[PDB]
Design an enzyme around this catalytic site. Sequence first.
Site, PDB file in Angstrom:
ATOM      1  N   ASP A 111     -11.465  -5.183  -4.156  1.00 18.04           N
ATOM      2  CA  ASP A 111     -10.956  -4.164  -3.391  1.00 18.04           C
ATOM      3  C   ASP A 111     -11.579  -2.845  -3.870  1.00 18.04           C
ATOM      4  O   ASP A 111     -11.903  -2.237  -4.975  1.00 18.04           O
ATOM      5  CB  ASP A 111      -9.667  -3.813  -3.770  1.00 18.04           C
ATOM      6  CG  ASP A 111      -8.684  -2.790  -3.298  1.00 18.04           C
ATOM      7  OD1 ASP A 111      -9.059  -2.072  -2.513  1.00 18.04           O
ATOM      8  OD2 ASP A 111      -7.615  -2.725  -3.509  1.00 18.04           O
ATOM      9  N   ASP A 128      -9.947   2.204   2.450  1.00 21.27           N
ATOM     10  CA  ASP A 128      -9.468   1.456   1.324  1.00 21.27           C
ATOM     11  C   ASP A 128      -9.357   0.044   2.280  1.00 21.27           C
ATOM     12  O   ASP A 128      -8.437  -0.013   2.956  1.00 21.27           O
ATOM     13  CB  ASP A 128      -7.816   2.076   0.985  1.00 21.27           C
ATOM     14  CG  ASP A 128      -7.308   1.314  -0.110  1.00 21.27           C
ATOM     15  OD1 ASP A 128      -8.036   0.464  -0.675  1.00 21.27           O
ATOM     16  OD2 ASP A 128      -6.469   1.902  -0.450  1.00 21.27           O
ATOM     17  N   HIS A 143      -0.131   2.484   1.932  1.00 22.71           N
ATOM     18  CA  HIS A 143       0.188   3.913   1.499  1.00 22.71           C
ATOM     19  C   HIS A 143      -0.529   4.693   2.622  1.00 22.71           C
ATOM     20  O   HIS A 143      -1.513   4.166   3.263  1.00 22.71           O
ATOM     21  CB  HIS A 143      -0.516   4.282   0.341  1.00 22.71           C
ATOM     22  CG  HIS A 143      -1.491   3.740  -0.148  1.00 22.71           C
ATOM     23  ND1 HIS A 143      -2.910   4.422   0.311  1.00 22.71           N
ATOM     24  CD2 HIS A 143      -2.116   2.558  -0.576  1.00 22.71           C
ATOM     25  CE1 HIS A 143      -3.779   3.923   0.095  1.00 22.71           C
ATOM     26  NE2 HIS A 143      -3.698   2.579  -0.511  1.00 22.71           N
ATOM     27  N   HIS A 197      -3.792   8.091  -1.986  1.00 23.63           N
ATOM     28  CA  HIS A 197      -2.388   7.947  -2.079  1.00 23.63           C
ATOM     29  C   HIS A 197      -1.684   9.457  -1.445  1.00 23.63           C
ATOM     30  O   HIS A 197      -1.391  10.179  -2.247  1.00 23.63           O
ATOM     31  CB  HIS A 197      -1.755   7.621  -3.289  1.00 23.63           C
ATOM     32  CG  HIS A 197      -2.294   6.319  -3.707  1.00 23.63           C
ATOM     33  ND1 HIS A 197      -2.110   5.860  -4.847  1.00 23.63           N
ATOM     34  CD2 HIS A 197      -2.729   5.247  -3.000  1.00 23.63           C
ATOM     35  CE1 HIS A 197      -2.656   4.695  -5.127  1.00 23.63           C
ATOM     36  NE2 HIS A 197      -2.955   4.226  -3.807  1.00 23.63           N
ATOM     37  N   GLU A 221      -1.769  -3.213   2.936  1.00 27.56           N
ATOM     38  CA  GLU A 221      -2.206  -4.198   2.080  1.00 27.56           C
ATOM     39  C   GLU A 221      -1.035  -4.942   1.626  1.00 27.56           C
ATOM     40  O   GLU A 221       0.102  -4.251   1.274  1.00 27.56           O
ATOM     41  CB  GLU A 221      -2.940  -3.363   0.800  1.00 27.56           C
ATOM     42  CG  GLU A 221      -2.118  -2.506   0.021  1.00 27.56           C
ATOM     43  CD  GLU A 221      -2.738  -1.588  -0.969  1.00 27.56           C
ATOM     44  OE1 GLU A 221      -3.598  -2.291  -1.754  1.00 27.56           O
ATOM     45  OE2 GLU A 221      -2.803  -0.364  -1.047  1.00 27.56           O
ATOM     46  N   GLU A 229      -6.360  -6.154   2.662  1.00 28.25           N
ATOM     47  CA  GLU A 229      -6.090  -4.784   2.937  1.00 28.25           C
ATOM     48  C   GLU A 229      -6.988  -4.198   4.105  1.00 28.25           C
ATOM     49  O   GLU A 229      -7.928  -4.614   4.021  1.00 28.25           O
ATOM     50  CB  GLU A 229      -6.102  -3.898   1.826  1.00 28.25           C
ATOM     51  CG  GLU A 229      -5.998  -2.388   1.984  1.00 28.25           C
ATOM     52  CD  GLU A 229      -6.028  -1.689   0.772  1.00 28.25           C
ATOM     53  OE1 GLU A 229      -6.790  -2.095  -0.158  1.00 28.25           O
ATOM     54  OE2 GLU A 229      -5.346  -0.812   0.416  1.00 28.25           O
TER      55      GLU A 229
END
Length: 355
Positions: free
Chosen positions: A128, A139, A208, A216, A241, A336
């Site tokens: 990740d 992300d 998120h 975030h 994710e 994700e």
Amino acid sequence: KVQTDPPSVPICDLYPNGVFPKGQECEYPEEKKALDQASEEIWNDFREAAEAHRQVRKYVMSWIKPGMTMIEICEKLEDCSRKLIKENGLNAGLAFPTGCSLNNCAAHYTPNAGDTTVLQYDDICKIDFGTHISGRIIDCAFTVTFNPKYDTLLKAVKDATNTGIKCAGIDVRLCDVGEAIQEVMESYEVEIDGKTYQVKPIRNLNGHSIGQYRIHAGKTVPIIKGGEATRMEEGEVYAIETFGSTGKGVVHDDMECSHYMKNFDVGHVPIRLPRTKHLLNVINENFGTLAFCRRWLDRLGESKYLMALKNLCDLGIVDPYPPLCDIKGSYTAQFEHTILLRPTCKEVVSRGDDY
Ligand SMILES: CO[C@@H](C(=O)N[C@H]1CC[C@@H](O)CNC1=O)[C@H](O)[C@@H](O)[C@H](O)/C=C/C(C)(C)C
Ligand SMILES: [Co+2]
Ligand SMILES: [Co+2]
């Protein structure tokens, strides 16, 4: 010019007119077109970062193998990422540390200096990592395995993540996305080393919303039912994710911490303590509100900074993000993608031909 076998050509140099490739554009579950075009430069920055992510991960998949230490893996990936994103201070660079969480550990693990951990044949590793252009963060993550016994577990999580991606959209309730993800995830049963398991979402891990220089941003996308009925809005960006586990389906802090990130809401804080003051300045200069890890401080020439770092955490200026793991003996997987809720459509900007 084209990309060299082992990637080394910056994405921006592969794209002459400065226009980067769009991701997968989807229909949601005139004037809005004008509104969409008005933020074109923003979407374009996300696309540049996404193309770097796609090329870096393709490279990683070609050489990651058991026998390599986790440090060797992260340094090789990060070196490539810095070159393709054409690192330039806070204007272009790595959005956060390379997660490479193993087995029962689902997220937030990256090696610190001295870590002798070696990737094994039976390991299930979650890669990740993130890239960014002008604070527009990608992300995106996938799971690496070498033993076919985990194939169905990986498929379960892939399907669950794609279900969450398909359900996402403007005016969609976040709790509905979580409920949808869970029903798909739990519809899978797997057999590993003689024992059967019903795949379980890790209930305390979530997707998120994403904001400029803020991984975030404030909203949460659950992966189980029972969440908030808050709705997704036009113009927002989300990281969808999901995590599947053969354990308890819940993670707890474990092992030594490697990830840290300045609290976005904390404003300027005057510090007279010399070493603590210097470290905070180094963080503000090199990372801002983006996450970092200890290896990245070592790289900048910093040493004997652990107490200074602890001080910043105790003061609430910086927050630690320790590894999150399920019970010993369990296996976890993750996938994700970053999506853009554009006025005219939904763009899975980080989508590739791989996943
Ligand atoms: C499980 O890891 C994800 C995560 O925490 N999600 C958060 C989402 C915001 C709140 O709901 C708190 N709970 C979470 O699970 C991360 O966003 C990772 O995908 C990301 O790559 C890593 C980020 C850090 C901050 C550790 C650098
Ligand atoms: Co991630
Ligand atoms: Co995330």
